[PDB]
Write a sequence for this structure.
C-alpha cells in the first residue's frame, strides 16, 4: 500500500546587492514522498516539492520522479520581492529574485519498508537585483547578481 511521508527544509540567507545590502530572507519548503510497500528499496519515487514560506515557484517542475538507482534529487526554489528607496522622486524601485536550492538525499540500503533520508545541508543560494528610478517596480526580465554574505539553517522555532 502507499505510505505517506513528508519532510520540511528551510534556509536563511543574507545578500549584498548594488542598491541595498544586508537583505535577509527565509525560504522553507516541504517534500512529500509516497512509498509503495510492495515495491522495495529501489523503487522509482514521485517527490512533490511545495512552498512552506516564500517560494513563488520551483525550477524546474516541482513534481519529480527519482530513478530507482538515484540517491538524491535537487530543486531550486524561486522567491521574488520588491524593495523601494523613497528618499528621491521618483524613488529607486528594485526587484529581487532569490534562487535557493534544496536537495533530498536517500539511503536506499535502508529502504525495505519505507523511505530513509540522509541529513540535509544548507545549499548556497544566489540573489539577483534590477533597479530603476521610476514610479513602477521593474519586471523580472533581466538581473545583476548580488553577493551572498552568508547562509544556513533556520533556527528551530523561527
Amino acid at each position: 500500500y502507499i505510505k505517506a511521508n513528508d519532510i520540511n527544509f528551510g534556509t536563511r540567507s543574507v545578500h549584498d546587492c548594488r542598491e541595498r545590502t544586508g537583505i535577509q530572507r527565509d525560504v522553507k519548503v516541504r517534500a512529500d514522498i509516497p512509498f509503495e510497500t510492495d515495491d522495495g528499496p529501489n523503487q522509482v519515487l514521485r517527490v512533490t516539492w511545495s512552498n512552506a514560506l516564500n517560494v513563488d515557484r520551483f525550477d524546474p517542475l516541482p513534481i519529480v520522479t527519482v530513478p530507482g538507482n538515484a540517491a538524491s534529487t535537487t530543486i531550486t526554489a524561486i522567491h521574488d520581492f520588491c524593495l523601494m528607496n523613497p528618499t528621491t522622486s521618483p524613488p529607486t524601485r528594485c526587484l529581487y529574485q532569490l534562487r535557493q536550492p534544496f536537495t533530498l538525499g536517500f539511503d536506499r540500503t535502508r529502504m525495505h519498508n519505507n523511505i530513509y533520508l540522509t541529513p540535509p545541508n544548507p545549499q548556497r543560494p544566489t540573489m539577483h537585483e534590477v533597479c530603476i528610478r521610476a514610479d513602477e517596480c521593474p519586471a523580472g526580465r533581466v538581473f545583476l547578481e548580488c553577493s551572498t554574505r552568508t547562509y544556513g539553517a533556520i533556527p528551530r522555532g523561527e
In short: The chain has one domain: 2-153.
